[PDB]
């Protein structure tokens, strides 16, 4: 019993909130507005089964925009290898990562 | 997936408009009125293609135009502009309403000269 | 995800095990309930502020409003319980066993 | 050089607390047909020094039946809450410029009650528990009306920032378009600071000494300077809200001296209120802020919501 | 209804004043003509960036310069 | 960063005065000095007995009215909107509902204390 | 109770139910759940006895904890989805927490303990409102999220609640505890079929609501709350004994009465997908339910228990009760079996 | 007479004069002879760090005029 | 270490939660929930939403003081187990603290833990944004837009609160 009254009557009660890419006060965009737009437009009117089969790439890319698992995973790999290289003694950091390089602007 | 693309450091080098924020805030209206065309071209392109890697030459052009406008300002009315941006820069919140006298002086000198 | 999420859900699980194992005091379980709602508030506003969902900033205020409404309901029921028996012990609510 | 700024904020406020105890004792002498302390020094200028040295060489006296942890923790919380109360106050530049300073005062006003409550609870006394529950009832009486008065006043300011309150009344005083709100604000801060006629916590007649009836010297002095710092900053808060002065960004000392004179006159009026009226009951106060202040405040909040829409006088939020 | 008003003003004037103030605040934005000016002032406050539209060729209403005559001006905000 | 420095400075100012108020003077502590004070006579029972409270309904509605005014504080920012009529109507309706709740408690003798 | 306040509270309960039923947002679903619970608390405290306080406290704690689990599942879905729409959940953890929250709200075993106690401690009308109205919003939300529920969890809950309700209904002499255990068994029956065909769940919901409403109206009209009090009805009104006889016969799934139609269509739907052991087990535990129904109908209809002397004084007065829609609801609860293909309107 | 409290009142006056003047002087010293910048919103913060970057001293109150450019 | 500021605030958050979820005495439970609310306000203030932190701090302080009045009236006994006065309370407090410090040591060594989700080891400064917000604060503007967008939310919240007042007044009636 999803007695959908809102589309029958033509009023909206919670439709403006339900997604991240809706209308915002003076058009403040979210962090992953474009990815939500792509995933929403990929999976409109095709049903949930075809949504999980035919929009897996867009949905998983949007989910990586949301939580950022793989980004911090790669950063962890880089950080760990740099620390091991520093401790072992095969690497020296460049001067622009040390604190001064006459910054650009 | 794909290797992400990035322009080389020689493509990003440019002469910089090296002034404080009070210099920008004092001459904000003259800069907006005089240099509207490259600024608006850059803004239209930057809002259209949503990519800073494809919007570099227009940033270069807007930097040259802003620097040309400031170099024109320096040639004629350096001293009223100096006093005006000093009176702007003393204020903590950089109020416009505390320097209407320097506003009138700078406006008169710029209007009569250029 | 981030480790602040780890600590927030770990606090939620602590207060959940606190609510589900009684210590012969109903008001302490009410406090654990408010702790769980506080944890829900913190988790929600952390993700909402991180992902810049600006229209959803009105939500946790509403969630905390309903939290306090149900807390007031719990306190009123506790006044009735303490007005029937001597104290607020949860072992006195055993009439419905026969 | 921030620590120097913090020290030069926190030392003069407690010096002024001691001299406010002096001035209060002198005024409370002089209104009641007598004199104040004028024997210890030249016109009694050394009385707060003698009181302060005396209170720190007396016995500490932690009770046996009292939970020692909360007993020691409560005066520390009281003094720290009174000391961090003063931070975002613009005189004319605050120590810490804050986007939302008013809500910070409200939250710290909520927190400072807990020192009174825990000092009453920890000291195993019936009079202390009576004073603690009277403090609870006083807080649930005043807090709603205080917050909604400050909300309906700040609607003409545009933001919760206290420094904007200087700019928003540089033409005319804010006591003119919100004079009823000014009077109920003054009464609400009279009730907040536990001062007469709304004492009801440190009652020397209904009780003996209230929540600190077991606190001997030293720890008791912490509550004393906490309360006096509270009354000074609350008068300062009222002065900033309704009696803003002329501010010159080149000479801030003009605003400082104008503001200081106005806040001193407000504290003189505060002690004037102290020595004029009998103390209320602690249920008559509850029937005062709810049956008399709250409906008028709801009406005034309707009025101050509709009025900027009415006159196209919506203040900037920047 | 005048006798009741006299009695309630004789007994609890605070409630009478509150009811009058609340009624005033309810019924005044309906009849006042200055509210539309407040609406336009709120609308004409530039929080965002006014991004320009691509000139296809048929758009004579939108200006090409901030000092062009066509476009929404703010003279009424100066006069009021 | 400056706020934590200020809070720590206030805290170690407060805890310095207490710590010098406990170890400095001469102490004479007996099993009569620390007894509870009951106006000179021995107390008749403990101080941890149930101290019954008559204003419970006012405390519950204090929670509800505190949350009502918590909902009401975004008003200075909400006055900076474009849909001004709807914002004005919802603000007025919320405040009117608050006043309706207060009036219903007033007419039903809820604010009057028990016993 | 003031009837104006009672009317306002009842309309607020209904408003919370439709706010759950018509919203497209998880937060609005949660708001409807909260307002429904907080508005139905004082209906259970109408008579102001200690048993009502106990029932209200236990119900409040159970629904509060279930709402917390509901909110946690909603927040985890927000995290892993970035949206709020009422559809399938994008996390198995959120699906499991939402399923346990709705099971705790439905009184499903092993979260079934509060239901007989809460049903016993409150009046008959409040128990009817509980067991019929409150068991629609969780069923609606379960209807919304059927792509995401784990089959093993929901089938475990269904067969566990069916077995536990059928076993627990054998040891009760109070009518409200009997009705609560019967309710537990029926929710097991409905949710065993939800992942296969939810139209079967809607049909079972409607028939169970009609049947238990008819029986609660009969118990209210006779003003009996224990079986020994029910046994006096043959000396008071024999037609009411006939009515409770046919409704108890229908409630056990005995054909050709309308209560057998839901179980028949459940068995019909669950064997299209090659599940044969499960409907047989549900049929045998339905036989246990029919057993304690048979015990009740032996007590009230097919025998004449001894009566008292004041029953003559009760004979001299005709009833003036407001038996609203009792004959229509009895007819619908008994003879709706030749109109079985009417169920297609719920598709 | 009644003017003998005025010693203590004047002492309170100077004790409340001290902190505001101290904050004004400290703000005017540690910011290069000018008022302290007020960064209420992130645009002002970005501008302040822009000055901190163009200054080249890692001190934003050292303000570079138009004589820096060519 | 200072980059882990939200980590330290969340560890104080969990410490207060396990302090008051042992249920020693509702006075000390009130102290623990006050601590947890204050440090949660701190956490969400470093994430940027100062208004939300101030509201949750103020609301929880008011509720905690009222419930303190309640337990001084209702939930109190002769010798309250404040802490260490009971075996099971001290045992479960030590158990929770030990478990929390154990998983903190685990995540500060492997830089990745798997309890049912997967949590990373660095600070939460990485997941911030490099852009500016212009001339507005996002959280304040969202709760401002509550009035202009969420009329339905306002209606249901106000109605729920009004009938909540009615509910609590018709519960404590006695007959
Ligand atoms: C800081 C700046 C100055 C602040 C001003 C105050 C300074 C002086 C202080 C004096 C001493 C106060 C000591 C404490 C006193 C505490 C008691 C107290 O005040 O109780 C409040 C008293 C309470 O009165 P009460 O206690 O007698 O109540 C009687 C109650 N019954 C009848 C039930 C028994 O007054 C109020 O509540 C009034 C609040 C202020 C109202 C302001 C109204 C403004 C005008 C509105 C419009 C009027 C025109 C008509 C309508 C027109 C419409 C267009
Ligand atoms: C904010 C205002 C207050 C600021 C902080 C306090 C400022 C003043 C600090 C100094 C106060 C005086 C000295 C400490 C207190 C002494 C109290 C007392 O009676 O001591 C008696 C005691 C002597 O008592 P006694 O040894 O005869 O024993 C008395 C007890 N019977 C007889 C039972 C055994 O003095 C001391 O113990 C000496 C204390 C330190 C003296 C100075 C040392 C050098 C300081 C440089
Ligand atoms: C056992 C009993 C308890 C013993 C310990 C007691 C400790 C002291 C208790 C009193 C102090 C409690 C403070 C609670 C949080 C207060 C937050 C606050 O004051 O925020 C104000 C301000 C808001 O900033 P905003 O308006 O957004 O403007 C900045 C934009 N440029 O914010 C700022 O300007 C930001 C400054 C940095 C903020 C860092 C994050 C907060 C740090 C919290 C530390 C832990 C506090 C623990 C409190 C426990 C209370 C019981
Ligand atoms: C439409 C306007 C906006 C309405 C919504 C906003 C309202 C804002 C104000 C909210 C007030 C909340 C509290 C109201 C309580 C009313 C009931 C009540 O308590 O009445 C009691 C009082 C008599 O006092 P008593 O019986 O002694 O009380 C017990 C101890 N005091 O009884 C009385 O004094 C009589 C109370 C009823 C009559 C009041 C008449 C006021 C008329 C003012 C002028 C006309 C204004 C135009 C609108 C019409 C208003 C009816
Ligand atoms: C895995 C599930 C269990 C996680 C916690 C395990 C350690 C704590 C429990 C130890 C065993 C004792 C126990 O359960 O006591 C129940 C206690 C109330 O027991 P009570 O009636 O006071 O006394 C009878 C016991 N002799 O009630 C309580 O202790 C309730 C408070 C529990 C607070 C738990 C907080 C620590 C974090 C747990 C993991 C998250």
Q: What is the Cα–Cα distance from F72 to G163, expressed in whole angstroms? A: 52
Q: Who's near D140: CB < 8 A, 6+ residues apart?
A: D286, F55, F58, F59, F62, I65, I66
Task: Choose among G61, G68, G10: nearest CA to G40.
Answer: G10
- What is the rounded radius of gyration, in angstroms, for the C-alpha atoms of chain D? 20
Does the distance separating the beta carbons of H2 and D15 come in below 8 Å? no
Contact (CB, 8 A) for I96 and I18: yes
Task: Choose among B18, B78, B83, B88: nearest CA to H68.
Answer: B18
Q: Can you name the residues that pair with I113 across neighbouring β-strands?
A: I119
Instruction: Give the domain ranges of chain C.
Output: 1-86
For residue C2 the two structure tokens come to 């981030």
Is C53 at the interface with chain A, CB within 8 A?
yes
The chain B residues in contact with chain D (CB within 8 A) are: 90-92, 98
Contact (CB, 8 A) for C63 and C40: yes
Grouping H, G, I as helix, E, B as strand and the rest as coil, residue G174 is strand
DSSP run (H or E) holding D114: helix D102-122
Q: How many residues does chain G have?
A: 347
Contact (CB, 8 A) for I2 and I123: no
- Whether F115 is covered by a domain: the verdict is no
Task: Say which residue the tokens 């005396």 belong to.
Answer: D54
Contact (CB, 8 A) for G185 and G170: no
Query: Measured in angstroms, how far is the CA atom of residue H22 from the centroid of ligand 3?
Result: 24
Q: Give the orientation angle of helix G3-22 with respect to helix G124-133, to 10 degrees.
A: 10
Residue G269, number of CB atoms within 10 A of its CB: 18
The chain I residues in contact with chain D (CB within 8 A) are: 27, 31, 34, 50-51, 54-55, 57-58, 61-62, 65-66, 68-69, 72-73, 82, 135, 137
Q: What is the Cα–Cα distance from G235 to G231, expressed in whole angstroms? A: 9
Q: What is the dihedral of CA A72, A76, A79, A84, to 10 degrees?
A: 180
- Whether F76 is covered by a domain: the verdict is yes
Task: Choose among B68, B80, B78: nearest CA to B35.
Answer: B68
Instruction: Domain of residue F28: give its range.
Output: 1-108
Q: Does C25 contact ligand 5 (Cβ within 6 A)?
A: no
Q: What is the Cα–Cα distance from C58 to I52, expressed in whole angstroms? A: 10
Long-range contacts from B88-91, C-beta under 8 angstroms, 24+ separation: B88/B22, B88/B25, B88/B26, B89/B20, B89/B22, B89/H34, B89/H63, B90/D249, B90/D250, B90/H34, B90/H35, B91/D249, B91/H35
Contact (CB, 8 A) for G139 and G20: no
Q: How far is E6 from chain D (nearest CA, A)?
A: 19
The stretches of chain G forming alpha helices (DSSP H) are: 3-22, 26-40, 50-81, 92-106, 114-121, 124-133, 137-144, 151-168, 175-191, 198-222, 227-230, 238-251, 260-270, 277-300, 311-315, 326-334
Query: Measured in angstroms, how far is the CA atom of residue D5 from the centroid of ligand 1?
Result: 41
Contact (CB, 8 A) for D237 and D166: no
Task: Choose among G70, G69, G80, G282: nearest CA to G189.
Answer: G282
**Is the Cα dihedral E26, E31, E34, E38 positive or negative?**
positive
- What is the rounded radius of gyration, in angstroms, for the C-alpha atoms of chain F? 26
DSSP run (H or E) holding I136: none
Candidates E20, E25, E42; nearest CB to D306:
E25
Q: Which of left, alpha, beta for G257 (phi over 0: left; psi -120 to 50: alpha)? A: beta
Task: Say which residue the tokens 């952390």 belong to.
Answer: C46
Q: What is the Cα–Cα distance from G56 to G266, expressed in whole angstroms? A: 34
Q: Does E15 contact ligand 4 (Cβ within 6 A)?
A: yes
For residue C24 the two structure tokens come to 């012969």
Is B112 at the interface with chain A, CB within 8 A?
no
Does the distance separating the beta carbons of C55 and A22 come in below 8 Å? yes
The angle formed by the CA atoms of residues I97, I100 and I104, to the nearest 5 degrees, is 135
Q: What is the Cα–Cα distance from G2 to G10, expressed in whole angstroms? A: 12
Q: What is the Cα–Cα distance from D164 to H33, expressed in whole angstroms? A: 23
Q: What is the Cα–Cα distance from E10 to E23, expressed in whole angstroms? A: 20
Output the DSSP codes for I59-121. Answer: HHHHHHHHHHHHHHHSS--SS---SSSSHHHHHHHHHHHHHHHHHHHHHTTSSEEEESEEEES
Output the DSSP codes for D171-185. Answer: SS-TTTTTHHHHHHH
Grouping H, G, I as helix, E, B as strand and the rest as coil, residue D313 is coil
Task: Choose among G48, D309, A11, D215: nearest CA to F92.
Answer: D309
Q: What is the Cα–Cα distance from G65 to I92, expressed in whole angstroms? A: 22
Grouping H, G, I as helix, E, B as strand and the rest as coil, residue D241 is helix
Q: Does E41 contact ligand 4 (Cβ within 6 A)?
A: no
List ligand 1's pocket residues with C-beta within 6 A: D 180, 182-184, 186-187, 197, 238, 273, 277, 288, 292-293, 296; E 12, 14, 17, 20
Closest alpha carbon within chain G to I175? G48
Long-range contacts from D51-57, C-beta under 8 angstroms, 24+ separation: D51/D18, D51/D21, D52/D18, D52/D221, D54/D217, D55/D217, D55/D218, D55/D220, D55/D221, D56/D217, D56/D218, D56/D221, D56/F17, D56/F20, D56/F21, D56/F24, D56/F25, D57/F24, D57/F25
Q: What is the Cα–Cα distance from E69 to B24, expressed in whole angstroms? A: 27
Instruction: Domain of residue I168: give its range.
Output: 2-172
For residue H24 the two structure tokens come to 């004004």
> Domain C1-86 carries which CATH code?
1.10.287.3510
For residue A75 the two structure tokens come to 């950063």
**Nearest atom (ligand 1) to Cα of D187:** 14
Contact (CB, 8 A) for H49 and B20: no
Task: Say which residue the tokens 């309308």 belong to.
Answer: G258
Q: Who's near C86: CB < 8 A, 6+ residues apart?
A: none
Looking at residue D292, what DSSP letter applies? I
DSSP run (H or E) holding G134: none
Q: Give the orientation angle of helix D219-242 with respect to helix D102-122, to 10 degrees.
A: 160
Task: Choose among D22, C83, D181: nearest CA to I73.
Answer: C83
Q: Does C13 contact ligand 5 (Cβ within 6 A)?
A: yes
Instruction: Give the domain ranges of chain H.
Output: 1-70
Q: Who's near H19: CB < 8 A, 6+ residues apart?
A: D8, D9, D12, D13, D91
Instruction: Give the domain ranges of chain G.
Output: 1-347
Q: Which of left, alpha, beta for A60 (phi over 0: left; psi -120 to 50: alpha)? A: alpha
Contact (CB, 8 A) for G140 and G87: no
Is A13 exposed, middle or buried (CB count within 10 Å of its CB: 0-12, 13-18, 19+)?
A: buried
For residue B23 the two structure tokens come to 């210099």
**SS3 per residue for E9-77:** HHHCHHHHHHHHHHHHHHHHHHHCCCHHHHHHHHHCCCCCCCCCCCCCCCCCCCCCCCCCCCCCCCHHH
Q: What is the dihedral of CA D139, D143, D144, D147, to 10 degrees?
A: 180
The angle formed by the CA atoms of residues D73, D79 and D82, to the nearest 5 degrees, is 135
**Nearest atom (ligand 5) to Cα of C16:** 40
Grouping H, G, I as helix, E, B as strand and the rest as coil, residue D50 is helix
Instruction: Domain of residue B75: give its range.
Output: 1-114
Experimental technique, in short, is cryo-EM
Output the DSSP codes for chain F. Answer: -HHHHHHHHHHHHHHHHHHHHHHSS-----TTTTS--STTS--SS-SSS----S-HHHHHHHHHHHHHHHHHTTHHHHTT-S-HHHHHHHHHHHHHHHHHHHHHHHHTT-SSPP-
Task: Say which residue the tokens 């669950």 belong to.
Answer: G270
For residue D153 the two structure tokens come to 């006043």
Output the DSSP codes for G243-299. Answer: HHHHHHHHHTT-TTSTTHHHHHHHHHHHTTTT--HHHHHHHHHHHHHHHHHHHHHHH
Tally helices (H) and strands (E) across chain I. Answer: 6, 2
**SS3 per residue for chain C:** CCHHHHHHHHHHHHHHHHHHCCCCCHHHHHHHHHHHHHHHHHHHHHHHHHCCCHHHHHHHHHHHHHHHHHHHHHHHHHHHHHHHCCCCCHHHCCCCCC
**Nearest atom (ligand 2) to Cα of D52:** 2
The stretches of A1-105 forming alpha helices (DSSP H) are: 6-9, 33-42, 47-54, 56-67, 69-88
The total of structural domains in chain I comes to 1
For residue F91 the two structure tokens come to 């603000």
Looking at residue D212, what DSSP letter applies? G
Q: How many residues does chain D have?
A: 318
Task: Say which residue the tokens 């309890």 belong to.
Answer: I115
Residue G92, number of CB atoms within 10 A of its CB: 13
Does the distance separating the beta carbons of I23 and C25 come in below 8 Å? yes
Q: Any contact of G with H, at least 3 CB pairs below 8 A?
A: no
For residue H14 the two structure tokens come to 């100077």
Q: Give the orientation angle of helix G151-168 with respect to helix G175-191, to 10 degrees.
A: 160
Q: What is the Cα–Cα distance from I63 to I71, expressed in whole angstroms? A: 12
Task: Choose among G82, F85, A25, I133: nearest CA to C55.
Answer: A25
Task: Say which residue the tokens 């259970």 belong to.
Answer: G44
Q: Who's near E77: CB < 8 A, 6+ residues apart?
A: E40, E41, E44
Q: Which phi and psi (to 5°) does residue G153 adopt? A: -65, -50
Closest alpha carbon within chain A to B9? A104
Q: Any contact of H with C, at least 3 CB pairs below 8 A?
A: no
Q: What is the Cα–Cα distance from I80 to A29, expressed in whole angstroms? A: 53
Grouping H, G, I as helix, E, B as strand and the rest as coil, residue G226 is strand
Contact (CB, 8 A) for D209 and D59: no
Q: Which phi and psi (to 5°) does residue I112 adopt? A: -165, 130
Task: Say which residue the tokens 């300062």 belong to.
Answer: D236
Q: What is the Cα–Cα distance from D316 to E45, expressed in whole angstroms? A: 10
Contact (CB, 8 A) for I67 and D140: no
């Amino acid at each position: 019993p999803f007695f959908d009254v809102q589309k029958k009557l033509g009023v909206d009660l919670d439709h403006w909130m339900t997604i991240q890419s809706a209308e915002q006060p003076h058009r403040i965009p979210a962090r992953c507005h474009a990815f939500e737009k792509e995933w929403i437009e990929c999976a409109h009117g095709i049903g949930s089964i075809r949504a999980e089969k035919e929009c897996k790439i867009e949905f998983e890319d949007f989910r990586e925009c949301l939580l950022r698992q793989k980004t911090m995973k790669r950063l962890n790999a880089i950080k760990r290898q740099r620390d091991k290289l520093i401790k072992e003694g095969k690497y020296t950091p460049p001067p622009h990562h040390s604190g001064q390089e006459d910054l650009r602007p | 997936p794909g290797i992400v693309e990035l322009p080389s450091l020689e493509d990003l080098k440019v002469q910089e408009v090296k002034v404080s924020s009070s210099v920008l805030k004092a001459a904000a209206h003259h800069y907006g009125a005089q240099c509207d065309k490259p600024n608006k071209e850059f803004m239209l392109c930057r809002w259209e293609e949503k990519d800073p890697r494809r919007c570099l030459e227009e940033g270069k052009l807007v930097n040259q135009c802003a620097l040309e406008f400031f170099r024109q300002i320096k040639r004629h009315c350096a001293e009223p502009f100096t006093e005006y941006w000093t009176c702007i820069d003393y204020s903590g919140l950089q109020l416009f309403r505390r320097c209407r006298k320097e506003q009138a002086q700078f406006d008169k000198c710029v209007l009569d000269k250029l | 995800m981030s480790l602040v999420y780890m600590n927030i859900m770990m606090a939620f699980t602590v207060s959940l095990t606190g609510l589900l194992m009684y210590r012969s005091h109903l008001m302490s379980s009410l406090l654990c309930l408010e702790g769980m709602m506080l944890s829900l508030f913190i988790l929600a506003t952390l993700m909402i502020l991180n992902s810049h969902f600006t229209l959803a900033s009105m939500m946790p205020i509403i969630l905390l409003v309903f939290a306090a409404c149900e807390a007031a309901l719990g306190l009123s029921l506790l006044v009735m319980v303490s007005n029937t028996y001597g104290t607020d012990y949860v072992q006195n609510l055993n009439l419905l066993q026969c | 050089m921030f620590m120097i700024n913090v020290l030069t904020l926190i030392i003069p406020i407690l010096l002024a607390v001691a001299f406010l105890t002096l001035v209060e004792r002198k005024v409370l002498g002089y209104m009641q047909f007598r004199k104040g302390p004028n024997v210890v020094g030249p016109y009694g200028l050394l009385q707060p020094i003698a009181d302060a040295i005396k209170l720190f060489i007396k016995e500490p006296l932690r009770p046996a039946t009292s939970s020692i942890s909360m007993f020691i923790l409560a005066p520390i919380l009281a003094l720290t809450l009174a000391l961090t109360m003063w931070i975002p106050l613009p005189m004319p530049y605050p120590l810490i410029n804050m986007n939302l300073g008013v809500l910070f005062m409200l939250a710290m006003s909520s927190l400072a009650v807990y020192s009174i409550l825990w000092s009453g609870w920890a000291s195993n006394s019936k009079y202390a528990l009576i004073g603690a529950l009277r403090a609870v009832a006083q807080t649930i009486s005043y807090e709603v009306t205080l917050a909604i008065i400050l909300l309906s006043v700040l609607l003409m300011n545009g933001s919760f920032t206290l420094s904007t309150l200087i700019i928003t009344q540089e033409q005319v005083w804010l006591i003119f378009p919100a004079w009823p709100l000014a009077m109920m604000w003054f009464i609400s801060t009279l009730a907040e600071t536990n001062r007469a006629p709304f004492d009801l916590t440190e009652g020397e007649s209904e009780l003996v000494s209230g929540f600190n009836v077991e606190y001997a010297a030293g720890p008791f002095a912490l509550f004393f300077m906490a309360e006096y710092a509270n009354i000074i900053m609350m008068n300062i808060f009222t002065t900033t809200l309704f009696l803003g002065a002329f501010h010159n960004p080149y000479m801030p000392e003009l605003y400082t001296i104008n503001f200081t004179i106005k806040s001193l006159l407000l504290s003189i009026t505060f002690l004037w209120i102290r020595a004029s009226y009998p103390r209320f009951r602690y249920d008559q106060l509850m029937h005062l802020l709810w049956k008399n202040f709250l409906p008028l405040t709801l009406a005034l909040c309707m009025w101050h919501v509709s009025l900027p829409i009415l006159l196209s006088s919506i203040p900037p939020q920047t | 209804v005048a006798a009741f008003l006299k009695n309630v003003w004789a007994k609890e004037p605070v409630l009478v004043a509150s009811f009058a103030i609340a009624g005033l605040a309810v019924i005044l934005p309906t009849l006042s003509p200055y509210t539309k000016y407040s609406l336009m002032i709120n609308r004409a406050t530039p929080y965002n960036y006014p991004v320009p539209l691509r000139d296809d060729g048929n758009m004579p209403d939108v200006p090409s310069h901030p000092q062009d005559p066509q476009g929404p001006s703010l003279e009424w905000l100066k006069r009021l | 960063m400056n706020l934590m420095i200020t809070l720590l400075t206030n805290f170690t100012l407060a805890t310095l005065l207490v710590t010098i108020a406990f170890w400095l003077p001469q102490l004479n502590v007996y099993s009569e000095k620390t007894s509870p004070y009951e106006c000179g006579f021995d107390p008749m029972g403990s101080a941890r007995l149930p101290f019954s409270m008559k204003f419970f309904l006012v405390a519950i509605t204090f929670l509800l009215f505190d949350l009502e005014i918590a909902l009401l504080l975004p008003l200075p920012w909400a006055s900076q909107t474009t849909n001004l009529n709807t914002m004005l109507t919802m603000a007025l309706l919320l405040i009117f509902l608050l006043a309706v709740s207060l009036a219903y408690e007033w007419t039903q003798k809820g604010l009057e204390w028990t016993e | 109770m003031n009837p104006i306040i009672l009317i306002i509270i009842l309309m607020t309960v209904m408003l919370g139910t439709i706010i759950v039923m018509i919203s497209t947002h998880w937060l609005l679903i949660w708001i409807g759940f909260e307002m429904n619970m907080l508005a139905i608390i004082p209906i259970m405290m109408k008579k102001h006895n200690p048993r009502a306080t106990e029932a209200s406290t236990k119900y409040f704690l159970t629904q509060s904890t279930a709402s917390m689990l509901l909110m946690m599942a909603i927040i985890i879905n927000l995290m892993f989805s970035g949206q709020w729409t009422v559809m399938k959940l994008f996390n198995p953890m959120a699906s499991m927490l939402m399923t346990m929250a709705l099971a705790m709200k439905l009184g499903m075993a092993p979260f079934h303990f509060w239901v007989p106690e809460v049903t016993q401690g409150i009046p008959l009308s409040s128990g009817l409102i509980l067991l019929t109205w409150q068991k629609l919003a969780p069923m609606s939300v379960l209807y919304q999220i059927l792509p995401s529920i784990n089959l093993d969890l929901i089938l475990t809950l269904s067969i566990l609640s069916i077995t536990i309700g059928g076993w627990g209904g054998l040891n009760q002499t109070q009518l409200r505890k009997i009705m609560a255990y019967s309710s537990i068994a029926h929710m097991g029956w409905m949710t065993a079929v939800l992942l296969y065909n939810p139209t079967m769940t809607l049909l079972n919901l409607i028939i169970y609501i009609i049947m238990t409403s008819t029986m609660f109206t009969l118990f209210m009209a006779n003003s009996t709350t224990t079986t020994l009090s029910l046994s006096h009805t043959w000396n008071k009104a024999p037609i009411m004994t006939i009515l409770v006889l046919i409704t108890l016969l229908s409630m056990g799934g005995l054909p050709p009465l309308s209560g057998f139609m839901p179980k028949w269509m459940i068995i019909q739907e669950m064997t299209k997908n090659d599940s044969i052991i499960l409907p047989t087990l549900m049929a045998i535990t339905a036989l246990l339910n029919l057993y304690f129904y048979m015990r009740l109908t032996y007590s009230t209809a097919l025998t004449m228990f001894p009566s008292t002397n004041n029953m003559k004084m009760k004979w001299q007065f005709p009833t003036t009760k407001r038996m609203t829609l009792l004959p229509t609801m009895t007819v619908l609860s008994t003879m709706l079996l030749p109109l079985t293909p009417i169920l297609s309107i719920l598709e | 007479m009644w003017f003998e409290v005025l010693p203590g009142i004047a002492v309170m006056g100077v004790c409340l004069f001290i902190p505001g003047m101290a904050t004004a002087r400290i703000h005017r010293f540690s910011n290069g002879g000018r008022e302290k910048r007020v960064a209420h919103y992130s645009y002002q913060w970005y501008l302040m760090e822009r000055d901190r970057r163009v200054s080249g001293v890692n001190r934003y109150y050292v303000s570079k005029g138009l004589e820096n450019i060519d | 270490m200072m980059t882990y500021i939200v980590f330290i605030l969340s560890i104080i958050f969990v410490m207060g939660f396990v302090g008051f979820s042992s249920k020693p005495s509702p006075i000390y439970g009130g102290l623990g929930l006050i601590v947890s609310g204050g440090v949660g306000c701190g956490i969400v203030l470093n994430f940027g939403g100062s208004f939300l932190g101030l509201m949750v701090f103020l609301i929880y302080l008011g509720g905690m003081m009222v419930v303190f009045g309640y337990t001084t009236a209702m939930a109190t006994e002769q010798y309250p187990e404040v802490w260490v006065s009971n075996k099971v309370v001290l045992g479960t407090f030590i158990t929770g603290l030990l478990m929390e410090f154990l998983m903190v040591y685990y995540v500060l060594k492997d830089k990745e833990v798997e309890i049912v989700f997967k949590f990373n080891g660095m600070g939460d400064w990485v997941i911030y944004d490099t852009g500016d917000s212009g001339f507005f604060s996002e959280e304040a503007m969202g709760i401002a837009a509550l009035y202009s967008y969420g009329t339905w939310l306002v209606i249901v919240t106000g109605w729920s609160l009004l009938i909540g007042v009615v509910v609590i007044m018709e519960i404590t009636r006695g007959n």
